[PDB]
């Protein structure tokens, strides 16, 4: 790792500076270096890791979608080659994240909160791989995302209240998986609705701060349901 010579605390600090500078590729590299120090991550550190790579892969996905649409309208080799270039870099980022989860974030995560967070991430990055996959690896990728998401759901329902923001975001993303990847829009709609209603009924238990956290994600569930019905 090019970050192996930097102190863990300095890597975290620089990840926070990169975030403020909207330098998400740097941020992700700093957080990768932090993970590779081998210690567990705190909640804030998990959020830093997730924000960094979500932004990196998000830009790659947006670019891939633009190029894929151009490629589709066109059907020279240039559009395909350049789509393939972006696709390969995107898969590389996903493989990097999944590698971090497998070596060794998931196995070392004892607390429910951390294990759910990382299994959700594993579902997310297999989902991003599935978006660009074509073939027999596609089915295996899709089922792998589902298994990670469902294991995270089972833990979150045992160990977290229905308003917990990681539980809510897991459900939000798994719902999107059902709708856009698994061709299961009724499953997606049922999951977002049940998640929303269960959280609504639990809001009475929350402080003002927790209420803010939970209703932010509940709004995204409602935003998707409005789009889907």
């Amino acid at each position: 790792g090019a970050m192996g010579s930097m102190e863990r605390a300095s890597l975290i600090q620089k990840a926070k500076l990169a975030e403020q500078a909207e330098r998400y590729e740097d941020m992700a590299a700093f957080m990768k270096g932090a993970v590779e120090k081998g210690e567990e991550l705190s909640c804030e550190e998990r959020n830093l890791l997730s924000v960094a790579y979500k932004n990196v892969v998000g830009g790659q996905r947006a670019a891939w979608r633009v190029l894929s649409s151009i490629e589709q309208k066109s059907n020279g080799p240039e559009v395909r080659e350049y789509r393939e270039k972006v696709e390969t870099e995107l898969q590389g980022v996903c493989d990097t994240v999944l590698g971090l989860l497998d070596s060794h974030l998931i196995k070392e995560a004892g607390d429910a909160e951390s294990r759910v967070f990382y299994l959700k991430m594993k579902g997310d990055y297999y989902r991003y791989l599935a978006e660009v996959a074509t073939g027999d690896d596609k089915k295996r990728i899709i089922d792998s995302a589902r298994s990670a998401y469902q294991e995270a759901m089972d833990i979150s329902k045992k160990e977290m209240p229905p308003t917990n923001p990681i539980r809510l975001g897991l459900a939000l993303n798994f719902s999107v998986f059902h709708y856009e990847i698994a061709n299961s829009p009724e499953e997606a709609i049922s999951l977002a609705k049940t998640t929303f209603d269960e959280a609504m009924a639990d809001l009475h238990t929350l402080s003002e701060d927790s209420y803010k956290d939970s209703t932010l994600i509940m709004q995204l569930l409602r935003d998707n349901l409005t789009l889907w019905t």
Partner: peptide, 5 residues
Amino acid sequence: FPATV
């Protein structure tokens, strides 16, 4: 395109 977090 739908929201994810």
